[PDB]
Structure formats: structure tokens, C-alpha cells
Amino acid sequence: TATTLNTPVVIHATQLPQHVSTDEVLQFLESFIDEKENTNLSSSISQLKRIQRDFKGLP
Amino acid sequence: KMQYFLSTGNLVSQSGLDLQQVSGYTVVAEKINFYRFISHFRMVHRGSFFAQLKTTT
Amino acid sequence: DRLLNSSDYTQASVCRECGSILTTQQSVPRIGSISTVCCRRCSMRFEDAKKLLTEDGEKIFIDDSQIWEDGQGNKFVGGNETTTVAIPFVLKYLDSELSAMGIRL
Amino acid sequence: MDISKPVGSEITSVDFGILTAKEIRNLSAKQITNPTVLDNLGHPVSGGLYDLALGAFLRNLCSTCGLDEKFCPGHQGHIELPVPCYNPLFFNQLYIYLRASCLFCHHFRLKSVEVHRYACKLRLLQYGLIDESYKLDEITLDISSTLLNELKSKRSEYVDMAIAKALSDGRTTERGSFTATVNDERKKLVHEFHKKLLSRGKCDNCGMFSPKFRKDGFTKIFETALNEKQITNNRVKGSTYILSTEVKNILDTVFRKEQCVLQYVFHSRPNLSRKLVKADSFFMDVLVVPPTRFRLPSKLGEEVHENSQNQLLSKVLTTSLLIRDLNDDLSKLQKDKVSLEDRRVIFSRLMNAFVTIQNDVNAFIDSTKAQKVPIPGVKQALEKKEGLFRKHMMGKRVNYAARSVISPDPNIETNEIGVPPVFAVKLTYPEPVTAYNIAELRQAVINGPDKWPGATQIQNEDGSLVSLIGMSVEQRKALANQLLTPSSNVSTHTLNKKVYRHIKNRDVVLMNRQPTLHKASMMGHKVRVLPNEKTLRLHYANTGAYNADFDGDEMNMHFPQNENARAEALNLANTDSQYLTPTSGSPV
Amino acid sequence: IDITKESHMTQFEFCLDNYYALLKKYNPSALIEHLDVESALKYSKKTLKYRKKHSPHYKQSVKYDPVLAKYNPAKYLGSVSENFQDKLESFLDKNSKLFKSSDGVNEKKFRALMQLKYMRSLINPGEAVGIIASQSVGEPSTQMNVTLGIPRLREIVMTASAAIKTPQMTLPIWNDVSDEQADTFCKSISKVLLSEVIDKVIVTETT
Amino acid sequence: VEAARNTIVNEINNVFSRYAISVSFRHLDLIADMMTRQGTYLAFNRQGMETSTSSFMKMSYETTCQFLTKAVLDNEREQLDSPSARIVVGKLNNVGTGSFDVLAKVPNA
Amino acid sequence: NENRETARFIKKHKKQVTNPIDEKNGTSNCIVRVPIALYVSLAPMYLENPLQGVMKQHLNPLVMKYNNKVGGVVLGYEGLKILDADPLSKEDTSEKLIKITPDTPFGFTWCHVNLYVWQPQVGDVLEGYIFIQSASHIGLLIHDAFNASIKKNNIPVDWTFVHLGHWVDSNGEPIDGKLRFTVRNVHTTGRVVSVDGTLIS
Amino acid sequence: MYKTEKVDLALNRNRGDPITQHFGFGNDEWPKEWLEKLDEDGLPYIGTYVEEGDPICAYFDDTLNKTKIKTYHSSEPAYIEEVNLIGDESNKFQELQTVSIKYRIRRTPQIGDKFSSRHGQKGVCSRKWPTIDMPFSETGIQPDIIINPHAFPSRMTIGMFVESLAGKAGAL
Amino acid sequence: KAIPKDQRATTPYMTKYERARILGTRALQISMNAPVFVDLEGETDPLRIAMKELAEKKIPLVIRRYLPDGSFEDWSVEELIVD
RNA sequence: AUGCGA
Ligand SMILES: [Zn+2]
Ligand SMILES: [Zn+2]
Ligand SMILES: [Zn+2]
């Protein structure tokens, strides 16, 4: 991923970030991972599941 | 000096020999055709300086 | 297609913050660092950098002369004819410049 | 070009403007100080014109990016000029402004309130409010400072009102107003302004008698004496050579004291950048160094001759080092040496050296500004018949093109062109492979570069090129079964392979015959490869549009490489769309 | 109007002998749903009235601009130059007897066809008409009392010289002005230099 | 101005008519309108070109350095409209097929 | 004037947030949600899945990856919206419009998306499960995702070795499981992103 | 068509020191298929067919320890007509560093080749018409050349008409 | 800049230049694996395919007619009279 | 740059 056909020309934020709660983070994680599971990114998604597991209590 | 001048045709001297140009005096015999070879020695030029003129008189 | 695409079409670096296509350079990599696009004009000398009154983390890039820079990471690539690059050669000597605008940074 | 490599950062405009020595020093990849060019009889001199910081060379990587001669784009160095000198291109300008100043007050010899009136007109003409610019002249009332300030107040009030109206009315914008008529009214105004600026043959704001300024032509200004009537008039109001340095020190202060008008005098549009107008723009305190990439030597068949830029720039560096040597004389002398007039010769070195270096910078800019076939400078490089702009910008050589003597043939269509199989096998189209063209391109690859509708090369979606110039029928057979392979990298999953197929009977080609005299002389014809031909074959019906005849006429054949250029050459430029001329609409 | 279209735009009789073919090309039923067929035609009727009312150049009743000024000629069929409209109507009137020999075409369906040909003959948005102009003046100038040919064209186009080489002013002479009066006036305006009257000059320098 | 315009179109029409050349009046009429665009008799040489707004078009005709100097001294900005100027920067020419843009309608569901 | 340029350094080099310790007993909320605007390319092959095109092309490679602009490793995206190229179409249309380049079949579009980014800063107190223990570092893993290492020099000498043997804490028992540290530095110039931690502050 | 070439090894040498290149070989490692064109003395066999890429000579420079060759670069094949060894004007130069090689390129009449009468009415050959397809006279012949009649009305080359009828009478 | 759809005032007809660009760009898209919305019917030339797509007006392209002011009119293929 | 082909 090195050129326009893969990488965005420009990225800008429109507001100052918002400190998503643990509960909002977990709900986002579950919705994103669950919606995506239904491609080497899958392996990073597996890491997101570990984050999910770490934000769930136990590895 | 005469091989160089005869090999380029850029004749230059402290009087200019009273001639309107300092190049073009020499031509390759270009023997590609006997017609061309004999024609070179019966060719005469009005000179480059009149080649530069815009008119036709 | 004729006067460009089939002649000297070049994707050339331009600095989105300074509007020139000739200060751009490839920053030097390291065993842990890739080659990164940097604009020389948009980079502070690591010897200054308000260091007397003052880092982001990823704004230091190094020159083949081992020179540290801060910034210069805001340049992109745009399609132009290479002779255009030839213009900075003479024009930049002429003490003038091209501010090649684009996008809207 | 590749359709597989888009960009989305197009240039939308081009700003022009002068550099600054601090900008050059900050961007500069190196200072070049050594008038040497090569070292060890065969090496790039350290910190010289061929230092590797100025790009890659001789398998030496660019010392500024570490990139090969085939990869390094190159980087621009700079020269710290001994003195300041004069920018030739603006020498006519700065000379005018020298003649326009007052030397005892350092103001323009034109009435200050009249100057402010000029600033008003040029401000209204940045927004192109011409009717208001002319309406300003009407504001009218020994003249008190309260009254001249009342004129400045009323005029500023008119600028503020006419602007507030025009921005309210959207009849202009913060970005200015620019049209052919506005440009013309500006040039007219700035001309009359320069005539008023030059008209004052003594000052007015200070009443002082400025000297008459004379010039050599391109390297020296002199300051003429005054008359005892004017000198004693100056006291009651109480030719000399000058250096570029003195001019710079005067013009800095004059250009600062008159910044308020010059803000709009030096911009035809609003200076949004609040850029101060500095005198250092007409003088060169430093000199840049072009990329080595553009300084390569002139090798003609075998002979390697040094670049003429290296020669003129080396002359600047040598002369500059001589002046540096005079500065060595200042470290040398100047302890005190109270009566050593010995420096009377070093003073000849200062005048001669200084005019000499200035002249040599001029010569490097414009050969016709120095003092037998003098290497050309950038001014000669850019202009005349060539004008880099004309010979390599407004027209260029092009790839995917052929030239050949045309031969008649009545059996082809009147819209086709008979392409000899040398061109049919030597001209390619970059065809992306799909499910619908896999058969044809697989066959073309199987044929190889040495057949008919085969294909010379295959460009992967990964960007790499695989030439078929020397592959065997076996290897090309193997690649034919790989033209349709799956994705491999998320970086490339959106692309499909490309095949450089030979020109064939389904492509359109743009034929041009010199005379171009009109658009109808360069039409698109449908390619028909003719066997055992060696000449571009053309139907007789076209010969009255090209004004072509088989006597020996040669034609250029252009092969467009893009579906946009194909569709246009089949729909807009095509011969059938040219059955009538626009001159008269009589069939040609 | 595009020059590459105009050639037959004023050849009505030909279009008539090929009426049904051109009706098959430019069939309007496909297009009559995308445009207006009346607004311009109505302006054409009121303006044709005012135009026949004022059919002296600079004491006419200026009030009605041409239909091309008031309606996009590509959108309301009938917005056409008054010269073309005039020629078309005059053709339909001078051939009413040809309109009494046809299978059945009429000046309203034929006039409709010629208006639609006019709409379909217009220059496309974006046409490179500048370049086309320049080539249409240059290219034919290669075949080339007052200055003629290329020097004359250069004297105008290239230099716009305020000093013509052969400046002339044409003077129309009233119908009442006799030819003999005209020769008298020709003598009366021409310059007469003093040299032109001198026969001999004898200087006897004595000192 | 209108009389000089009609005189131009008549004089050029006479020059071509002398050689029995047909030339559409639309061409001559356009050229005349362009020579009078400022209300005067603005020839087509460098002098008339000075008043045009595209600095690259000036640069690419004649006195390249003179137009460059007058441009820099102005701090001019090129709005990159001239076809020549646009070629200089490797931009789709604004004439003809580049007189407009093409976008795509794409399904959102 | 000489303070415009220093306003340029401070106001251009300012940092947005200082993620605090949750309840002052957890870890810093370096995970934040920030709505951004990106400019991405759309291939023709996704012309029938354009939001999915933008996803598979640009946004999918961004997850679990550091972005200098966002200041962290993108934890995920929320609410993709293609900015319509054409007004007078409300906001809920059945098709959008996008500009195609004047040279290629590729499209370019504006996108608005919320990013979930892990934005750690120096001073943040974090806990990790010990990955490794070598005599110059202790490897840990934050949330089972972020690699972290505390080199011997940044650990208090008052810590105790037990022989790759084992480290024993300053209290007199060997370390085990999780460690609480302050963030000294984050190294993202390499292939991945290593967070430099300290046990001495 | 004959093209003459000078293969010089001093064209820009530098006296005694410089000399080291000798036509021939040394490393053996060269492709022995070069003998297919160059004789064991380093000069091509007079008569050899050569196509672009074939070696026109081979030599050896001690500094490079390599067998080098001067390649032939042309659009068409030729044949070597003469190879002339030049030691001349030299003081010693015994190493035979200058060689003149003449290439013979045959030029068959072909479509596009120009032909002209003694009347300045020049034309390219549009095609090489089959003899069967040519027109044949009742004399049993088919012409060598066919010239379009419509060329004469503008040129008024009627001297060519008379030359045709005079050459016909004079041949008969 | 947005010329309201109710206010579009330009030629209802597709110019030859408009048709040329549409057919070229759309053809190029089909040649880069844009989804074909019509039967390929045997064809292999992407340009003739785009011509078929124009013949059925299935093309999903829009012409942005520029005005020198900067206002523009977004026109569908499915409305601009093709010829 | 000279000559020259169209
Ligand atoms: Zn920059
Ligand atoms: Zn470099
Ligand atoms: Zn004064």
C-alpha cells in the first residue's frame, strides 16, 4: 500500500477526538469485528479480538 | 592552416580578402554520380551574403 | 496524450505547503526506517528547532549528510512533464519561483 | 503514462515570485565554494560543482539522498556571492527606482499626498474597480498637514467604501479581480506613475537636489555632480561611481519608507501573504546551484566537453575567490597601515574585480550582457527560435510514432491506413486483460513479438515489466496461462495485468503530414496492416486534404496509447468528420 | 451556425426533393418532448410583424432584438437569424406553386423541418473556433493601386499599422452629381505642388 | 470602433475576394471582434499580446524574458487558462473534450 | 516581527489531547474516537460497491496500523460517508456522484469517517503481561496487542536479578504477570510500533 | 550501396603508453561463435554476411583483460567488401590500430523507391505489379514501367512523349 | 456553483465532444473491469462495448457542463439527446 | 550549423 490506488491522498480531522468509554470501545469492537468476520487483515482482526479479550478481562 | 581552412571553408585573414563572407567557400565533391562530379566544377555561386537577402532581384 | 503521456510524463514531488516541485527529496532510511518523502523547505534544522524554547516523534528525517530535519513530511506527487522540472533549473537561478498550487492544504 | 497509476493532486495555478537568500540557504543542499570541478584527475571535487550532494554521479550515490543517477532526482545547491550585485532581469527596474528616489530624505520626489493618491488608484485596480478608480480623481478641496491628512483620510475613506460596496455586491472578492481590461488599466496607470516618478528633477517632499544617475549599461551606476546653484540651494534648503552594495543599502531604506504604496505597486492583485517589499529582490546576495542532473557534460558521439554552465559558474567562483583574496588583503591590511597607499592597486582590484564579477554573473545570465562565440547562458538557453518553451514545451518529440514515405492504394477504405508489418510488429497498445479479451491476448502473447497480433511485452499489476523480446514459444506459452492469475497483494488487487499488443486492424491512428497548415491535414485513420509493404499506404481521396503527393512525400504516423485518445481519434479527428473544411465548407 | 453544416441550410429546393429522407434523419417526434416549439415561434410572429413594419437604417423602430438574442437557439425551435428566416419564408411564398405540385408537404411541416435542420446545424458547445478561424485565414493565404495578398494581410492582422502604405478613402458621389462635375471635383481636391507648375528655373549667381 | 471593425472585415474580405477565395464571414468577423476587444485596433503581435492575461502565453510567444520580468515584478499568478500555458504544466486542455468534466452515478446500496 | 514564526511553531506543533488515567487507577484513555476527512481513490472494479470499495482499498489496510496524522494505531472505523459531488440531492440518495480524473478511469472522492485510534503519550501509566525477561529489558504486551519493553537502564537498579534468568523486584520477590509503568516513548519509525516504557518514574 | 567505416584505436589514443588494444583475443572466455564472423586475426572474413549485432572486429586491451569487439549497428544486413589495414603515416604503430572496413548493402528496387525520367517527372514505385497482371501488347510484351497519363497535362513534359516515340523507332 | 436541476439551461443535445469523452472514459472503465451492464454479445473491443452501452443509455455517467463563470450543470446520459 | 528531400 504505497500509492493513490491504495493510500489516501489526504486525511484531516474535523473535531478534537472524543474519549470513548470502555463500554463504547467494547461495543465498537464487537460491532466492527462481528460485522467484518461475517485477506491478511483478518490476522490483525484476530489481534483486535485479543484486545476484545483484554478489554473483557482475561487473555 | 591551409588544410584546416580547406577542410572547413572558414577563410579568415587580417584583410578579409575583400570578400563578403567568411564561410562556405569549399564544397564536398560528392561523387555519388558522375553528373554531380562534373557539375561541381561548372557550378558558380553568387555567394552566401546574397543568399541572406530577402529580395529576389 | 501526444505532447505529454507519450513524451516526458513524470509523476514528480511537490510540497503541498510551499508550492514547489524542486525542494522535494527522498529522506534517508534506517535499519528500522523506510524511505520517506520530505520537502527541504518545509523542514527545520535540528540545530535550531526553537530547541532553546522547546517533539512530535515522527518529524525527524535524515539527509545523506546525516543531517536531522523536523517537518518536511507534507509533500505529494503530481503528474507533470519533466521539462517542467527543467524550468526550476533555469528559473530558480533567475531568482523567481513557481508556486505550484494543488488540492487545498 | 499508466492508467494503473492515478494522481489526484493536480496543479491548479502557478504563482511567480522572487526567491530570498535565506530561503535558498535553508533549502540549499550545499554551499559550493570550490571553483574546482573534478579531482584526482577523475573524481568529483569535494564541495565543488560536482559534489554528490547535487545528485548522483559516476555510480557515486547522490550525497543528499543516496540515490543512483537513475533514481536521484537531484538537489539544488547555492553560492554565497561575495558582494550583492544586481539582478540583470530587474536591472532596468531597480535603475528606475534609483532615479526615482531622493538622496537627502530617502523619499520619492513626487508629492507624498500625490503618491498616496497613486496607492489609492492601484488599490482600486487590484479589485479592478475601474469606475471608482477614475471617480477617485474628483475628490478635491501651502497645504496644511491637516489638509493633506484630510486628503489621505478622504481617499482611504473612498477605498474603504468602494471596497465595502464591491465585496457586498460580490462585484469582486478577497482574491482580487483580474481581466484583460484590468491588466491594461494597470499597465497604463503604472506607466503614467513611472512618468510622474521620473518627472521630478529635484525632490518635493524634502526639496533636495538629487544627483543625476548614469549607468555603464549593465554593471555600474555613477552619481553625477550637482551645480553650486543647486548645492547652495540645498544648503539654503539645509561621474561618481557607486557600488551595488551602496545601492542596496539605499534602496533597502527607500523601499521600506515607501512600503505603503509599493505594497500595491508591486502587486497587481492583493498581497494576501502580507509580504514586505524588500530591495534585496533586485540584487543577488547569493547564487543557487542547479541540480547536477541538468549539468551533465556535452558528449557528442565520443567527445566529452565540459558544460558551459560549469564554465561560467566556475568563473563566478574564481572571481569571487579573488575578491575573497582582497578580503584576505583586508585581514592582511586594515590593522592600520596608516600611509601604505600600496592598497591603491588592491583598490584597482576592488573596482576591476567587482565590475568583473558583476559582469560575469551577467554573462552567465545573458551572454549579450558581458564583455567570440561565448557559451550561452540561461537567457539564451530559454529564448529565440528554441526558447526551451518552443523547442521542448510547445512541441516535443513523441514515442509510439513512425515516419515513412507514403504509397497509394485504392483497395483500402478511404478511412484506413496501410501499415507495413515492420510497424505492425513494432507498435504496441497497452491492453488491460479481462475475461472478454483473455483469448485474444493469450494468443497474441503466444505469437510473441516476432509475429502478427502477438504482443511484445507484459506489464504486471505489481508494476514490473516482462519483455518478450527474447522469450521462447515455451516461455510465452507459460505466460499465456498466467495472464489471468488471481490477486496477490492488497496493494495490487484492484488492477489487472497489461499486455503490450502489436498494433492491429482494430486500432485508430493519427496521421499527420507536415503542412499541418490546417487541422484537416492531421486526421485519424483506421489501421489496416498490409503484408509485404514497407511504406505507409494511403487512399487517394485524402491527398487533397493533406496536400500530399506520392512524388516522395513523407508522413508521420502517431499511435495513441489511451482509450480517450482512441475514442477521440475515431469520433472527432476521424477522416469522415473532415469531409468539409471549416474555411468554406466545400468538400476537400 | 457551423460552417460544416451550413452548406445546404439555405438550399431549400434540394431539401424538398429529398424531404422524406431528411424527415427520416431529423425525425422530430423523438425530440419534440425535450424542447419548446412555440415560444421562439411566437416571438418570430410578433417580431416578424415589427420587422415587416420596419422593413431608414438609423431611424427604424428599435425595440425588438432578434430572436437569437432572446432565446437559446438550441432549445426553442425557431430561434433563427432574421436573414435565414426571411429567406425561408420568401422561398415558401415564391414556391407556393411548387407547393401546389407536391404529394402533400406543406410550408408548416416543411418550415418545421428547416427550423429543425437549423437547430441541428448549430455549433457545438466547446468548439475550437478560434484555432479553426486562424487556420481558415492562414491556410488559404498560402495560395497567394493598393497593397494586396500577404503584405496586405500582414499590414492588417499582424501589425494593425496606423500607417497604411496606400491609405485610401472612397467617396460616393450623389446620383445628381454629373460626371463632368465629378472630374471638376477630382481636380478640385487633388494636391498641386509648386514644382508641378514650374517649367524652367534660371539662377544667375553674380558676385 | 464599430466602423473600424466593419472596415477590417470588409478589407480582409476584399483581400481574399481578390484571389477568388471563399472564406466564411464568421472567421473574419471573429478575428475583427478579437482585434477590437479593447475598443481599439489591437494588433496580434507581442504589443497586443502584452494586455492578455495569461503570462505563460506571453512567455511562449516572444520576448520570453521580457514577459517573464514583467510577470515576476507583478508577483503575478497564472490562473492557468491559456491552452499553451496549460500545456506547459501538463494539464488537460480546456478546449473541446476538456471543456467539461465527467462524473459517475454509483449505487449506494 | 519575529513572533509570527514562533506562533507557527507552537500553534503548528501543538498536541490535541493528554489521555488521562481512567479513574486514575487504570490506563490512559489513549484510545480515542476522532472524526476525520480523508481523500481516497475509488477503482472502477468497486463501482458497484463504492463504500465497500473505499473500505477494502484504503480503510482495511489502516486497521491495526499506525497513522502519523491520527497519532496512533487505527483501532477501527465508524460511519463512513462519501461526500456527494452534487448539491440539490438532499443527503439520502440512491446513488452518489464522484469526479473522475480527466486522464484515467479511476475516481477520487472525499470521505468522512470516525477513527478509533490508540493515542498514547509520555507519562501514561500502563500495565502489561510480561512477555520476556532479558538482562536488559522486560517484554510486556498491552491489551494483548501492543508490544512493550522496559530496558534495564530505564528500570531502577533497586530491581533484582534471579538467574535469561529472571528479574526480582525491589521489594524482594520476583516479578510476575503484569507491570505498571510510565510511558517514556513510542517508537513507530520501524516496521511496527514499539512503546518505550519506564519503571523509574 | 557501399558504406565505408574507419575502426580506429587511437582516434583519441595517447602515444606509446595508451596502446594495448590488439585485434584478436586473449581470455578464451569469449563466445567462440564470434569466429563465425571474425577470422582468428580479429578481422571479419571478407565476404561475410553481417546483420546488426554481429561483430565487425575483435581486439584485446590488457587493462581490461577482456576480449572486446566493435559491433555493427544498422537497420539492414551488409557484406564485407574490403578490409584494409592501415599502418600508414605512422612512425611505427606496428600494432595495426587503424582498419578500414567497407560494407556492401544491396538495394533492390522496392515500393517507395524513387524513379525519374530524363524529364524531371519523378515518382515512387507504388507496387511491383505481377507480370501476368500487367497489360500485354499484341507484340507479346508487357511494359517495364507504366506512367499515369494525367501527369503530363500539368507538367507539359511532351519531350518525354517524343523520347518514347524516338526510343521506340530507334530500337526497332 | 450548483446550477439547480430545475434551472439547467443548456443544449438538450449531446455534443460530439461530449459523446467522444463519454465513450472514451466509459470504454476505459469497462477495459479496467468496470461492471458491464449489457450483453457483451461477443465483442472484444472495449470501445465498441461502450458504444453499445451508449446505444442502450445504460452508461452510468454524468456530464458536468462548465460555464465560464464556474457554474455547472450535471446532466445524465439518460436525458441528453445522444444524437 | 551546410547542403538537401517533401
Ligand atoms: Zn515545502
Ligand atoms: Zn539526491
Ligand atoms: Zn526627498
Domains and CATH numbers, chain A: 11-59 (6.10.250.3390)
What chain C holds in terms of domains, given with CATH numbers, is 1-104 (3.90.1800.10)
What span, in angstroms and rounded, lies between the C-alpha atoms of I22 and I47?
11
User: What letter does residue D576 receive in the DSSP assignment?
Assistant: G
Cell of D573: 479527428
F13, with CB counted inside 10 A (0-12, 13-18, 19+), is middle
What span, in angstroms and rounded, lies between the C-alpha atoms of D34 and G135?
52
What's the Å distance between residue B35 CA and nucleotide J4 C1'?
16
The 3-state secondary structure of D196-231, one letter per residue? HHHHCCCCCCCCCCCCCEEECCCCCEEECCCCHHHH
Q: Which of D12, D184, D383 has its CB closest to that of F65?
A: D383
Q: Which of F98, F102, F105 has its CB closest to that of G95?
A: F105
Asked if residues G42 and G53 have their Cβ atoms less than 8 Å apart, the reply is: yes
Neighbouring-strand partners of residue D308: none
**Angle, alpha carbons E59-E62-E65 (nearest 5°):** 145
What span, in angstroms and rounded, lies between the C-alpha atoms of H126 and H115?
11
Identify the domain containing residue D440 by its residue range. 427-503
Q: How far apart are the first and last CA of chain I?
A: 28
Q: Could you tell me whether strands G194-198 and G146-151 are parallel, antiparallel, or unpaired per DSSP bridges? A: parallel
DSSP 3-state helix, strand, coil percentages of chain H (rounded to 5)? 15, 30, 55
How close C15 comes to chain G (CA, Å)?
Answer: 17
What span, in angstroms and rounded, lies between the C-alpha atoms of D114 and D151?
10
Q: How far, CA to CA in Å, does G123 sit from each of D103, G19, G153?
A: 63, 10, 17
Determine if strand J comes within 7 Å of the CB of D514: yes
- Judged by a CB distance cut-off of 8 A, whether residue D94 touches chain C is no
What span, in angstroms and rounded, lies between the C-alpha atoms of E79 and E73?
5
* Residues in chain G within 8 Å Cβ distance of A28: 33, 76, 78, 116
User: What letter does residue H83 receive in the DSSP assignment?
Assistant: E
Pick the closest to residue D507 from I45, I51, G104 (CA basis): I45
Using alpha carbons only, how large is chain I's radius of gyration in Å? 14
Place of cell 472612397: E170
Q: E strands, chain G, where? A: 31-42, 66-67, 72-82, 95-100, 107-118, 125-134, 137-142, 146-151, 160-162, 166-168, 178-187, 194-198
Q: E strands, D427-553, where? A: 428-432, 457-459, 465-467, 498-502, 508-512, 522-529, 536-538
CATH number for the segment(s) I1-83: 3.90.940.10
SS3 C101: strand
Domain chopping of chain G, boundaries: 1-123, 124-201
Contacts (Cβ under 8 Å, ≥6 apart) of E108 = none
Residue H49 has φ and ψ, to the nearest 5°, of -75, 125
What span, in angstroms and rounded, lies between the C-alpha atoms of G97 and I74?
10
What span, in angstroms and rounded, lies between the C-alpha atoms of H27 and H44?
19
Neighbouring-strand partners of residue H85: H99
Look up the CATH number of the domain holding residue E102.
Answer: 1.10.357.120
Asked if residues F59 and C98 have their Cβ atoms less than 8 Å apart, the reply is: no
SS3 B28: coil
Closest amino acid to nucleotide J6 (CA–C1'): D553
Asked if residues D441 and D479 have their Cβ atoms less than 8 Å apart, the reply is: no
Asked if residues C93 and D366 have their Cβ atoms less than 8 Å apart, the reply is: no
Cell of E113: 423541418
What span, in angstroms and rounded, lies between the C-alpha atoms of F81 and I66?
14
Determine if strand J comes within 7 Å of the CB of D553: yes
Q: Determine A/B contact with 3+ CB pairs under 8 A as the test.
A: no
What span, in angstroms and rounded, lies between the C-alpha atoms of C11 and C3?
15
What span, in angstroms and rounded, lies between the C-alpha atoms of F59 and F88?
11
Helix or strand holding residue D473 (H, E): helix D473-480
D53, with CB counted inside 10 A (0-12, 13-18, 19+), is buried
Pick the closest to residue F77 from D130, D267, D394 (CA basis): D267
User: What letter does residue D60 receive in the DSSP assignment?
Assistant: B
Question: Mind giving me the DSSP string for D87-101?
Answer: -GGGHHHHHHHHHHB
What span, in angstroms and rounded, lies between the C-alpha atoms of D96 and D199?
12
Q: Which ligand number lies closest to the CA of residue D206?
A: 3
User: Across chain D, which distance is largest between two alpha carbons, in Å?
Assistant: 104
Q: How far, CA to CA in Å, does G110 sit from each of A15, C101, E162, G40, G113?
A: 17, 19, 57, 7, 10
Q: Which long-range contacts (CB under 8 A, 24 or more apart) does D408-412 make?
A: D408/D537, D408/D538, D408/D539, D408/D540, D408/D550, D408/H126, D409/D530, D409/D537, D409/D538, D409/D539, D409/H126, D409/H127, D410/D539, D410/D540, D412/D528, D412/D530, D412/D537, D412/D539
D156, with CB counted inside 10 A (0-12, 13-18, 19+), is middle
Q: Which ligand number lies closest to the CA of residue C41?
A: 1
Determine if strand J comes within 7 Å of the CB of D554: yes
* Residues in chain G within 8 Å Cβ distance of F102: 100, 102
**Chain I residue whose CA is closest to E31:** I81
- Judged by a CB distance cut-off of 8 A, whether residue G90 touches chain I is no
What span, in angstroms and rounded, lies between the C-alpha atoms of F19 and G180?
99
* Residues in chain C within 8 Å Cβ distance of G189: 30, 32-33, 58
Pick the closest to residue C78 from I19, H49, F89 (CA basis): F89
How close D277 comes to chain C (CA, Å)?
Answer: 14
What span, in angstroms and rounded, lies between the C-alpha atoms of F105 and G99?
10
User: What letter does residue G66 receive in the DSSP assignment?
Assistant: E
What span, in angstroms and rounded, lies between the C-alpha atoms of C18 and E128?
36
**Angle, alpha carbons G164-G170-G176 (nearest 5°):** 50
Q: E strands, D257-414, where? A: 287-289, 298-300, 303-305, 401-408
Pick the closest to residue F90 from G97, I72, C98 (CA basis): C98
Contacts (Cβ under 8 Å, ≥6 apart) of H76 = H52, H105
Q: In the CATH scheme, what is the homologous superfamily, with its name and number, of domain H1-108?
A: RNA polymerase II, Rpb2 subunit, wall domain (2.40.50.150)
What span, in angstroms and rounded, lies between the C-alpha atoms of H41 and H162?
59
What span, in angstroms and rounded, lies between the C-alpha atoms of C46 and G186?
20
Contacts (Cβ under 8 Å, ≥6 apart) of H19 = H9, H10, H13, H95, H97
Neighbouring-strand partners of residue C13: C77
Pick the closest to residue D400 from D483, D476, D507 (CA basis): D507
Cell of D167: 465585496
Cell of I35: 461492471
Chains within contact range of chain I (3+ C-beta pairs < 8 Å)? D, E, F, G
Pick the closest to residue C42 from C11, C70, C77, C76 (CA basis): C70
D278, with CB counted inside 10 A (0-12, 13-18, 19+), is middle
What span, in angstroms and rounded, lies between the C-alpha atoms of E47 and D298?
74
Asked if residues G176 and G129 have their Cβ atoms less than 8 Å apart, the reply is: no
Contacts (Cβ under 8 Å, ≥6 apart) of D208 = D102, D103, D104, D105, D202, D234, D237
Q: Is D432 left (phi over 0), alpha (psi -120 to 50) or beta?
A: beta
Neighbouring-strand partners of residue D214: D222
Residue D120 marked ligand-binding: no
What span, in angstroms and rounded, lies between the C-alpha atoms of A15 and G32?
12
Contacts (Cβ under 8 Å, ≥6 apart) of G99 = F101, F103, G85, G107, G108, G109
Residue D405, nucleotide of least CA–C1' distance = J6
CB count in 10 Å sphere of residue D120: 25
Contacts (Cβ under 8 Å, ≥6 apart) of E72 = E79, I9, I10, I11
Pick the closest to residue G144 from G129, G133, G134 (CA basis): G129
Contacts (Cβ under 8 Å, ≥6 apart) of E101 = none
* Residues in chain A within 8 Å Cβ distance of D7: 4
Determine if strand J comes within 7 Å of the CB of H114: yes
Asked if residues D98 and F74 have their Cβ atoms less than 8 Å apart, the reply is: no
Helix axes E82-94, E107-119, angle to 10 degrees: 150
Between the CA atoms of C4, C10, C13 and C19, what dihedral angle is there, to the nearest 10 degrees? -10
Way it was determined? cryo-EM
Distance between Cα C60 and ligand 1 center (Å): 15
Helix axes A41-54, A22-37, angle to 10 degrees: 150
Closest amino acid to nucleotide J3 (CA–C1'): B27
Q: How many Å separate Cα H125 from the centre of its chain? A: 21
Residue D62 marked ligand-binding: yes
Pick the closest to residue C45 from D26, D76, D22 (CA basis): D26
Cell of D482: 498466467
Q: Strand J: which nucleotides have any atom within 7 A of a protein Cβ?
A: 1-3, 5-6
Residue B43, nucleotide of least CA–C1' distance = J3
Sheet holding D213-215, edge to edge: D213-215, D221-223, D240-242
What span, in angstroms and rounded, lies between the C-alpha atoms of I20 and F94?
15
What span, in angstroms and rounded, lies between the C-alpha atoms of D265 and D50?
41
Residue D251 has φ and ψ, to the nearest 5°, of -70, -30
Q: Determine F/C contact with 3+ CB pairs under 8 A as the test.
A: yes
Considering the domain architecture, whether residues D454 and D475 belong to the same structural domain is answered as yes
What is the per-residue burial (b if ≥16 Cβ within 10 Å, else e) of D515-532? eebbbbbbbbbbbbbbee
Sheet holding C60-62, edge to edge: C43-45, C68-71, C60-62
Q: How many Å separate Cα G26 from the centre of its chain? A: 18
Q: Could you tell me whether strands H49-50 and H55-61 are parallel, antiparallel, or unpaired per DSSP bridges? A: unpaired
Contacts (Cβ under 8 Å, ≥6 apart) of B34 = none
Determine if strand J comes within 7 Å of the CB of B51: yes
Question: Mind giving me the DSSP string for D504-536?
Answer: -TT-EEEEE-TT-SSGGGEEEEEEEEPTT--SE
Residue D548, nucleotide of least CA–C1' distance = J6
What span, in angstroms and rounded, lies between the C-alpha atoms of I26 and I34?
8
What span, in angstroms and rounded, lies between the C-alpha atoms of C91 and F105?
44
Residue G87 has φ and ψ, to the nearest 5°, of -70, -170
How close G69 comes to chain F (CA, Å)?
Answer: 29
Q: How far, CA to CA in Å, does B8 sit from each of B5, B15, B28, C19, F3?
A: 5, 19, 10, 51, 60
CB count in 10 Å sphere of residue G122: 13
Pick the closest to residue D556 from D417, D448, D364, D430 (CA basis): D417
Pick the closest to residue F39 from E133, D184, D131 (CA basis): D184
Residue D216 marked ligand-binding: no
**Angle, alpha carbons D5-D567-C103 (nearest 5°):** 35
Asked if residues D218 and D90 have their Cβ atoms less than 8 Å apart, the reply is: no
B30, with CB counted inside 10 A (0-12, 13-18, 19+), is exposed
Place of cell 501573504: D273
Cell of D34: 570550490
**Angle, alpha carbons B50-B53-B55 (nearest 5°):** 115
What span, in angstroms and rounded, lies between the C-alpha atoms of D366 and F63?
13
Considering the domain architecture, whether residues D244 and D115 belong to the same structural domain is answered as yes
What span, in angstroms and rounded, lies between the C-alpha atoms of D470 and D473?
10
Cell of G133: 525477561
Q: Which ligand number lies closest to the CA of residue C63?
A: 2
**Chain A residue whose CA is closest to G44:** A5
Helix axes D180-199, D91-100, angle to 10 degrees: 50
Asked if residues D447 and D567 have their Cβ atoms less than 8 Å apart, the reply is: no
Determine if strand J comes within 7 Å of the CB of H122: yes
Cα four-point dihedral sign G178, G182, G187, G193: positive
What's the Å distance between residue B48 CA and nucleotide J2 C1'?
11
What's the Å distance between residue C62 CA and nucleotide J1 C1'?
49
Q: How many distinct helices (H) and strands (E) make up chain E?
A: 10, 0
